[PDB]
Amino acid sequence: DEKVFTKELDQWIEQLNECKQLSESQVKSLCEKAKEILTKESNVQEVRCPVTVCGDVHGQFHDLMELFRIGGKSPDTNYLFMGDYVDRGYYSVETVTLLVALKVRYRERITILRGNHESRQITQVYGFYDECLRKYGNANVWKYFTDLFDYLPLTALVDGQIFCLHGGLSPSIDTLDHIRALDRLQEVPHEGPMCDLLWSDPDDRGGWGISPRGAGYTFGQDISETFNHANGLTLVSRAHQLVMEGYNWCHDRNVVTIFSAPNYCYRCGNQAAIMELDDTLKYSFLQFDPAPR
Amino acid sequence: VDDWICEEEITGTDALLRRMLLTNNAKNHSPKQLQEAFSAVPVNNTQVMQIIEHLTLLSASELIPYAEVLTSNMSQLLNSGVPRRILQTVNKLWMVLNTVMPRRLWVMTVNALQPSQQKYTQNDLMIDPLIVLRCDQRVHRCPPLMDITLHMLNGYLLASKAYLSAHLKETEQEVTREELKNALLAAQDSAAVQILLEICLPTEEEKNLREVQCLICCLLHQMYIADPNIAKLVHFQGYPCELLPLTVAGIPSMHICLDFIPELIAQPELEKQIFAIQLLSHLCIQYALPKSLSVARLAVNVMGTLLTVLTQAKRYAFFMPTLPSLVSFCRAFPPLYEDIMSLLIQIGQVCASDVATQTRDIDPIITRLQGSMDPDVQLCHCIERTVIEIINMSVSGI
Amino acid sequence: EYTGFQVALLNKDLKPQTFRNAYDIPRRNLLDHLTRMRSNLLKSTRRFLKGQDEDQVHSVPIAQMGNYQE
Amino acid sequence: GQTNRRHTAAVPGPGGIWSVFHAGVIGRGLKPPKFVQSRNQQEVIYNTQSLLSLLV
Ligand SMILES: [Mn+2]
Ligand SMILES: [Mn+2]
């Protein structure tokens, strides 16, 4: 049973890498195994060094393939994706299918987090629902992928020292034990700890503030310093805003923005970047251009 | 200047007298003869000692052809059991060959003292001179080979200065480039100093050392009198405190180190302030001057001011490594006693107040009779031990 | 050092320029940084930079940088 | 219950006249090797017995 599913899933990886969509029953089985493998995973999953952390993909599949050509193939280099790989891109189902199949194939080598775009309402309004209707035909595969987004872990921890999440901090979160105590098994609300986890963003302020997004908050250097000191952390990695250079060290070498989708929405022209934590926590930046088409 | 000054006439042309009366027939010795003398499968040190002792008397121009065999066979001269004349006389022959063929000798000696292989050229050594400090582990406790390494490192540091100046001058096709080269040279010399000082540490396996320590002290004194900016940069960077006696007792140039202790103690960084306090204390032990006493009074005032302004954890981190320096200050200068004493009593009771803030596992307040503990009781114990040390210093101080 | 001495406090808006001055390099990475400095003076590229990490300040706009291209 | 010498001895290959591979260190390095606590339950239960006897 393990051998036949392993070789079938490897053929699924090979068929995904050449940009071919799967079938509905194959997505059914992939999503069911993904549900089984993601049930036994905490809100703060400890990812051991080394790991190559990548940021937002947002359904740019050829850019994802280039990313695998830069940082290394998925069997050989560890990856940690901070969500938001589903909307604002032409090839959306292939990207999420490749990530989920790589997760269920390599359970210690691919870590997948949850973004704010990976919810029912946002996928319904910003494009994944339409892509679902135009390729697979009905809205049922969107139902499996929304449940799969529902089970995804929120944050991740690298060697007890680097905190990786999609959005930003929270006025209601003070310790990492509160992250592990949240009920993750629900769609992201309009108010609460987890909406702020997936929606907040840093800014050069002196305190909290209403984010110009309709949800989440915004935080400054004092808040980030307090969170890093009170939790034994030294770095907060996140991927929520478009960056030209692909990386930002804001809040005085404490908060790191890593955007990994070059030419966002195919009209912005940003040079994306990813971070490569070695076995000595001894990092480097891989900065790349969009793929030829 | 050392290479040219070892060429000068020493006393009475005794070397000329020896080359007149002892090398009548030395044509039997050959470079290849020394080659199989070294490369015997047992270690017959007698015949190689014969050949090298006869090789002392020759002139440098006549000693040119033996550079190949000597340099290629330096690497065997590191095993446990070589006699000391072999090392010392190979050092003497290397010093003789340094007067004539220095650049080829250095680039040949790098490729031989490396650990056991990369063949290195002069351009790589002028670009980076720190491969000289990347020699074998056994070189670190062989005094003649370390002396060779130190002369080689000084030569390649000056070489890198000239090379960076020339490469900057050629590639113009300007102030920013010049200051960048200045910063590179300064950080380069500081890195060389720090690596030498870390060689001066005792190794963890043992926990000949003194010879390496004093040779490195000689090289550092020469580099400090060459330019004081390297000394200021290194003492701003810092080195472990166990080197603080050795660096102060052994390098006379540290006297000008009393010029920037006010500047070093004014830096916002805290561990720089502990380093400044400790370095000032060892200097006041070494050099007892009115300048040293004035900077000592400034140090006492700075410690009092930081006692006014410090958080408890930072107070422990600042006052734990300092307090022996107060013993040094009190030992150097009597007129500071009561001032020193005042600081102690103040720090004592403020730490005592901190002990009353929370419950403790040892309760030291009621212990007025005589591991991993609470930091506050450790600080109180450090205060009482430094008072014990001050009192026993005063009693036995005559 | 007599009635005119003030210990300097840490400034958040310091911007420690690690290539312009040897005083700003910490010990624990010093040799690392030294090699990087050497690489700069041996790069001989079209543009020479005096800072290792110049990411951005507050905002990264698409329109501001997209105007500086053809 | 609840440096520089060893740094420069091992910097061959990736350096030379070319820049080093990395961009820096995130913190001070690896976060220790992590401590493993070890107890024996008989001493735990009987010191607890002694304290509860004193309290009662
Ligand atoms: Mn996205
Ligand atoms: Mn997002």
From Swiss-Prot, chain A:
Gene3D superfamilies reported in the protein's UniProt record: 3.60.21.10
E.C. number(s) listed in UniProt: 3.1.3.16
Top-level taxonomic group: Eukaryota
Entry GO terms, CC: chromatin; chromosome, centromeric region; cytosol; extracellular exosome; FAR/SIN/STRIPAK complex; INTAC complex; membrane; membrane raft
Top class in the EC scheme: hydrolase
GO molecular function, one term: metal ion binding
Reaction catalyzed: O-phospho-L-seryl-[protein] + H2O = L-seryl-[protein] + phosphate; O-phospho-L-threonyl-[protein] + H2O = L-threonyl-[protein] + phosphate
Binding site for Fe(3+): D84, N116, H166, H240
Binding positions (Mn(2+) 1): D56, H58, D84
Biological process per Gene Ontology, one example term: negative regulation of phosphatidylinositol 3-kinase/protein kinase B signal transduction
Primary localization: cytoplasm
Keyword Hydrolase: yes
Co-factor binding comment: Binds 2 metal ions per subunit. Can be two manganese ions, or one iron ion and one zinc ion.
Pfam families to which the protein is assigned, alphabetical: Metallophos
Modifications after synthesis and translation: Carboxyl methylation influences the affinity of the catalytic subunit for the different regulatory subunits, thereby modulating the PP2A holoenzyme's substrate specificity, enzyme activity and cellular localization.
Active site as annotated: H117 (proton donor)
Residues annotated to bind Mn(2+) 2: D84, N116, H166, H240
Record-linked InterPro entries: Calcineurin-like_PHP_ApaH (IPR004843), Metallo-depent_PP-like (IPR029052), PPA2-like (IPR047129), Ser/Thr-sp_prot-phosphatase (IPR006186)
Annotated residues for binding of Zn(2+): D56, H58, D84
Entry's localization field: Cytoplasm; Nucleus; Chromosome; Chromosome, Centromere
Record-linked CDD domains: MPP_PP2A_PP4_PP6
Family: Belongs to the PPP phosphatase family. PP-1 subfamily.
Protein name as catalogued: Serine/threonine-protein phosphatase 2A catalytic subunit alpha isoform
Naturally occurring in which organism (per UniProt): Homo sapiens (Human)
GN (gene name): PPP2CA
Swiss-Prot record, chain B:
Protein localization: Nucleus; Nucleus membrane; Cytoplasm
Family the entry assigns: Belongs to the Integrator subunit 2 family.
Record function comment: Component of the integrator complex, a multiprotein complex that terminates RNA polymerase II (Pol II) transcription in the promoter-proximal region of genes.
Assembly and oligomerization: Component of the Integrator complex, composed of core subunits INTS1, INTS2, INTS3, INTS4, INTS5, INTS6, INTS7, INTS8, INTS9/RC74, INTS10, INTS11/CPSF3L, INTS12, INTS13, INTS14 and INTS15. The core complex associates with protein phosphatase 2A subunits PPP2CA and PPP2R1A, to form the Integrator-PP2A (INTAC) complex.
Protein name: Integrator complex subunit 2
Lineage: Eukaryota, Metazoa, Chordata, Craniata, Vertebrata
Residue window of the full protein shown: 724 to 1204 of 1204
UniProtKB/Swiss-Prot annotation, chain C:
Function: Component of the integrator complex, a multiprotein complex that terminates RNA polymerase II (Pol II) transcription in the promoter-proximal region of genes.
Name under which the protein is recorded: Integrator complex subunit 6
Phylogenetic placement of the source organism: Eukaryota, Metazoa, Chordata, Craniata, Vertebrata
Family of this protein: Belongs to the Integrator subunit 6 family.
Span of the signal peptide: none
Tissues expressing this chain: Widely expressed. Expressed in heart, brain, placenta, lung, liver, skeletal muscle, kidney and pancreas.
Parent-protein residues present: 523 to 592 of 887
Induction: Frequently down-regulated in nonsmall cell lung carcinomas and prostate cancers. Down-regulation in prostate cancer is due to CpG hypermethylation of its promoter. However, some involvement in cancer is unclear.
Entry's localization field: Nucleus; Chromosome
Taxonomic source organism: Homo sapiens
Assembly behavior: Component of the Integrator complex, composed of core subunits INTS1, INTS2, INTS3, INTS4, INTS5, INTS6, INTS7, INTS8, INTS9/RC74, INTS10, INTS11/CPSF3L, INTS12, INTS13, INTS14 and INTS15. The core complex associates with protein phosphatase 2A subunits PPP2CA and PPP2R1A, to form the Integrator-PP2A (INTAC) complex.
UniProtKB/Swiss-Prot annotation, chain D:
Subcellular location: Nucleus; Cytoplasm; Nucleus membrane
Protein origin, superkingdom: Eukaryota
Recorded family membership: Belongs to the Integrator subunit 5 family.
Function: Component of the integrator complex, a multiprotein complex that terminates RNA polymerase II (Pol II) transcription in the promoter-proximal region of genes.
Subunit comment: Component of the Integrator complex, composed of core subunits INTS1, INTS2, INTS3, INTS4, INTS5, INTS6, INTS7, INTS8, INTS9/RC74, INTS10, INTS11/CPSF3L, INTS12, INTS13, INTS14 and INTS15. The core complex associates with protein phosphatase 2A subunits PPP2CA and PPP2R1A, to form the Integrator-PP2A (INTAC) complex.
Protein name: Integrator complex subunit 5
Higher taxonomy: Eukaryota, Metazoa, Chordata, Craniata, Vertebrata
Gene that encodes the chain: INTS5
Portion held of the full protein: 707 to 784 of 1019
